[PDB]
Amino acid sequence: PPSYLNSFSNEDWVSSLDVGDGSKHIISGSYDGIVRTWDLSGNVQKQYSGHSGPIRAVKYISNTRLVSAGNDRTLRLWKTKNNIEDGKTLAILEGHKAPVVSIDVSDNSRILSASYDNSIGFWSTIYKEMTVVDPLEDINNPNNKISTAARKRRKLTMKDGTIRRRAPLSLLESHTAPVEQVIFDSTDNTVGYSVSQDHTIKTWDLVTARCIDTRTTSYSLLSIAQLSTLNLLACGSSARHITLHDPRQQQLIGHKNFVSSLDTCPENEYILCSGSHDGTVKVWDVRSTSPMYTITREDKSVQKGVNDKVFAVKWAEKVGIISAGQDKKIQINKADN
RNA sequence: GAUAAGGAUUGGCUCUAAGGGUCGGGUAGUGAGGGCCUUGGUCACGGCCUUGGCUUGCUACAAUUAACGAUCAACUUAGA
């Protein structure tokens, strides 16, 4: 049974989590716009500051590279050096027009971003491979009828230095409602299953940047995970259940609110974890239809319905199950046989 | 119709609410960010980790008659 191992606090809500492929550090995105790296002891190792709004997604690119997204429509690539280290923004990535809520990173140095502008961004880890965008050029080269107030408003957006800005490699635009999550294919690295609020699961041809196949669900979808080793797609919906789809059936029920995040057990082939806005994480066997363990938040000051939500859950193969949400604490559960 | 006239060169008193909106000021020193460079190890021209040289911040003297300038947006003959 997954037992409570350790828990360390934050200043504000935690919205995202990541551990990376092989490492011990925990990456957390918070609602203050600060990205924090932990060393399994509750001590902050690296801080990333500069996002205007709350962070909604963080991902691990390399030992010295991170990518983060937030309410401001800017992906930020962070580069560190290898007490407390302060990372520097390697690049800013623009063009979503609505807050970005999910990111994923592939093997071939590519990024997929899902935002509430019912569109998906196809981005590159290497910023030298993208067209640069000049914020000055909009108001300076034509300079047709831009007022002084508009010019000052535009200038006030560049007070935090002159940081590099890049344009997306492509815009995957077929959804009709905000997109909640997008993931790479665990094998192909060219297939881009995503879920949105328009009741659909869409698969994408990243080479041609178009939608290939669309499946319609009865309720809006909030989280998507892939089980390529047994070829299924688990989509947790706002209807408090997880639907299993065959990307070429069964539904898991028991949650009492929006299912926000999903993850898959790295050592077991049939086990996946789900976090929901009711404050409980649940581990599920694909062959069954009922939760086998239900983790709850271990805190004396937490209230079940007042401030208790799970915005991020992660299956880390070296430390267990990482949960984070409305309570500032980041919770670790054993989840090892 | 106010404002001294209405073929001419129209500009017209003192004090006293408002008179469309907005923006903008120097010379020097040092911190920051970008750009061109370049130097090593590393992975099949391209990455990864490292080395030395237009925007903005902080201080020191002039200007404070910016009583200036710039831009956006409005407007036409009340005479029978």
Summary, kept brief:
With 337 residues, the chain is mainly beta. It is built from 2 helices and 30 strands.
Structure explained in plain terms:
By secondary structure, the chain is mainly beta. The chain is built from two helices and 30 strands. The chain has helices at 135-140, 148-155, and strands at 4-8, 14-18, 26-30, 35-38, 44-48, 55-62, 65-70, 74-79, 85-86, 88-94, 100-105, 110-115, 119-124, 165-166, 170-172, 179-182, 194-196, 200-205, 210-216, 221-227, 232-237, 241-245, 251-253, 259-264, 271-276, 280-285, 293-296, 310-316, 320-325, 330-333. The strands form seven sheets. It has a five-stranded mixed beta sheet with strand order 2-3-4-5-9, with no helix packed on it. The protein has a five-stranded mixed beta sheet with strand order 6-7-8-10-14, with no helix packed on it. It binds one RNA strand of 80 nucleotides through residues 62-65, 81-82, 109, 125-126, 128-129, 136, 145-152, 155, 158-164. Component of the NOP7 complex, which is required for maturation of the 25S and 5.8S ribosomal RNAs and formation of the 60S ribosome.
- How many DSSP-defined strands? 30
β-strand amount: over 45%
Classify the secondary structure makeup into a structural class. Answer: mainly beta
Major sheet characteristics: 5 strands, mixed
Instruction: Give the CA-based shape.
Output: globular
Distance between the termini: 7 Å
- Total number of helices: 2
Helix content: under 10%
Instruction: Give Rg in angstroms.
Output: 20 Å
Strand order of the largest sheet: 2-3-4-5-9
WD repeats: 9-48, 50-82, 95-133, 174-214, 216-248, 254-294, 305-337
Function: Component of the NOP7 complex, which is required for maturation of the 25S and 5.8S ribosomal RNAs and formation of the 60S ribosome.
Organism: Saccharomyces cerevisiae (strain YJM789)
Family: Belongs to the WD repeat WDR12/YTM1 family.
